[PDB]
């Protein structure tokens, strides 16, 4: 075969014992990982969230940094590979997907058999209640706390955060973003386009559910900023350092009060679980949250440019096998999380070229978009592989 230009997919099987069957036409660019596919049901309206099909609906399109991926090499060779994927869901549901491909020049003919079982009859999969877009519902007190955090960034008090002000705060916390990085962070959340991050835009950014970044990740990263010496406790001096560097001036008395308020077990330091509880005496709790929200805002702004991108980690147990893993915390209509993990085993008919076995692990970042009716899916994928 040659490198791919066009592909087709027959994806079929059952979810909770209900049969589905879709047939699909697409294209992509093997030089950059791009794919697009149109799928239509042959068996009327889908009875489950098509979001669980998104990873399943063609790594022959994925290049590596300096040449072909092994997937591509196996297509060009003709000998090819087989794919076995399992997904485990937090409700105990499981899905298995097996693929076959055939190649005719630049054309891939793919078939994927999907069997999934154990989905709660009223959960988000069986009720089509998974979405790309949701936000937190904030109370007035939560909005008031975000406004305190916003004020740490708004150094001149003019009611908006500039690149100068965001850079100042990030630098105070040991991060050195470039001006272009600061402009990208702002433009990603700057709804009115003025070049600054105002309080409504700040609130909206903090309330957004990001596809591949959840509360646990943000609170874990925030703890890391406080816990400067990485010993798993925030001490009084570490708390003082974060507060001072953010611009929140505190007396020795106040630092002591904040530690005592958080320090449930009485050892004079704040462990990760005590921190989690603070981030979920009212004036001490509000001061912790002012700093915590500010730290989380920096983490969220820092990470926006890959917000739409999910990482897979690939290794080779031997010269004819790749094992890939990722995790996906789907978002529900009501802005809750629905966690899954995936494990995919690729079996190659011929041994992979030696340089693939040398360059382990590989990390592959994927962006996906799904537009769906009851009968039709429009899918796009963007991919990038890193050593
Ligand atoms: Ca300002
Ligand atoms: Ca703005
Ligand atoms: Ca520490
Ligand atoms: Ca403690």
Author numbering: 11 to 67, 71 to 293, 301 to 407
Direct quotes from the study:
Herein, we report the engineering of a series of the brightest green GECIs developed by the insertion of the CaM/M13-peptide Ca2+-binding domain into the mNeonGreen fluorescent protein. This indicator was named NCaMP7 and was characterized by a 1.8-fold higher molecular brightness as compared to the brightness of the mEGFP protein, which makes NCaMP7 the brightest green calcium indicator among all GECIs reported to date. The NCaMP7 indicator demonstrated a positive fluorescence response to Ca2+ ions, with a high dynamic range (ΔF/F of 27) and high affinity to calcium ions of 125 nM in vitro. The overall structure of the NCaMP7 consists of two linked domains—the mNeonGreen fluorescent domain and the CaM/M13-peptide Ca2+-binding domain.
